[PDB]
Subunit: 109 residues, 4 copies
């Protein structure tokens, strides 16, 4: 698992479950090509987005649909979504509040 995303809910103190996200890879013409996607599990984790062979050097974007998540809970959010854009084992963690988010990368051997 070369890429995993973990999402947490700072309002309810829980994993953020059923959070949808898409992963994009930047193409030569500088547009974003869909690469992978999924929803966080009950543990707020999304695994198996890609494989080692497939996960080559490049600029990747993770677009997390935080807006739909807050809407399903009945809470008005500030952001349309949360993006994480980086040059590429990776774990991306995102901590969500209605008017704030934080994201960190844990890059290991």
């Amino acid at each position: 698992c070369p890429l995993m995303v973990k999402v947490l809910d700072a309002v309810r103190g829980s994993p953020a479950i059923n959070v949808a996200m898409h992963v994009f890879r930047k193409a030569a013409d500088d547009t974003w090509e869909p690469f992978a996607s999924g929803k966080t599990s009950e543990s707020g984790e999304l695994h198996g987005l890609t494989t080692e062979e497939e996960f080559v050097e490049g600029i990747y974007k993770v677009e997390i649909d935080t807006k739909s998540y807050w809407k399903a809970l009945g809470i008005s959010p500030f952001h349309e979504h949360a993006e994480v854009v980086f040059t590429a084992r990776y774990t991306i963690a995102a901590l969500l509040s209605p008017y704030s988010y934080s994201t960190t990368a844990v890059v290991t051997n």
Copy 2:
């Protein structure tokens, strides 16, 4: 001043100075059109991006060039940039302060919205 951005450096415990950022607005055809740009001052703040007349309802994107900031300090950061995308003014004019806190492998953003 309906839109202000403040950027802080969590490694040095200082304002993040001379951080470039570009603001875009989503056009009718769903493309990002350039709206405004600037660099943070010695206090880590960027004022005067726009005016109340210009800052109409819409979806806005603030793209903060955190990578060049970290690189100029000898650090290779994780993120290409930090984005903030939000719908603005859809219930009438508001004032928005976007605050970003930067580390090489992490960032956080919060918004303060006032009437």
Copy 3:
């Protein structure tokens, strides 16, 4: 103004107003002695806690009463309070801004230190 504290509310996207906090200084006998206290204003800021003369070298603790803040809004938060403990002025006088961002189950604190 050598010590200022700014508190923001991540749920409402607003300054956190009327947040009480107490500042303590570590005494010679290793106990926390009361140093100063106050409440945040309508802009989420607390100024005038101390002066340059009073604010000598030492270890300081700022205890922010986040629990009462959340409770007054009908939320049962996780944390009793948010603390910031730091050595101040040991290389000469500095100015400290302590920023806290609050959610019911989370908080973040950062310091901006200037000469």
Copy 4:
């Protein structure tokens, strides 16, 4: 495992390893009694601090020695340590930078 702590390093993008912390429980005379302690593993996690039987309702303090961690890396930190004080399955996560820290609780069934 009713209580676990996870610590991450926002400067190096890694788990924070060998971070020492003590856990205290507030006593009737309102002082802090030592309760448990340990160091984070290579995954930045600290497990087995307590048991279900032992982990009763009360006010707990987790005092994380972030200062020694930054010092061992050669970086001057702002904080003496990072405290997490709460009324009590709990996971406390802390994300560390030299002049900043964030902490969140994930409270599950």
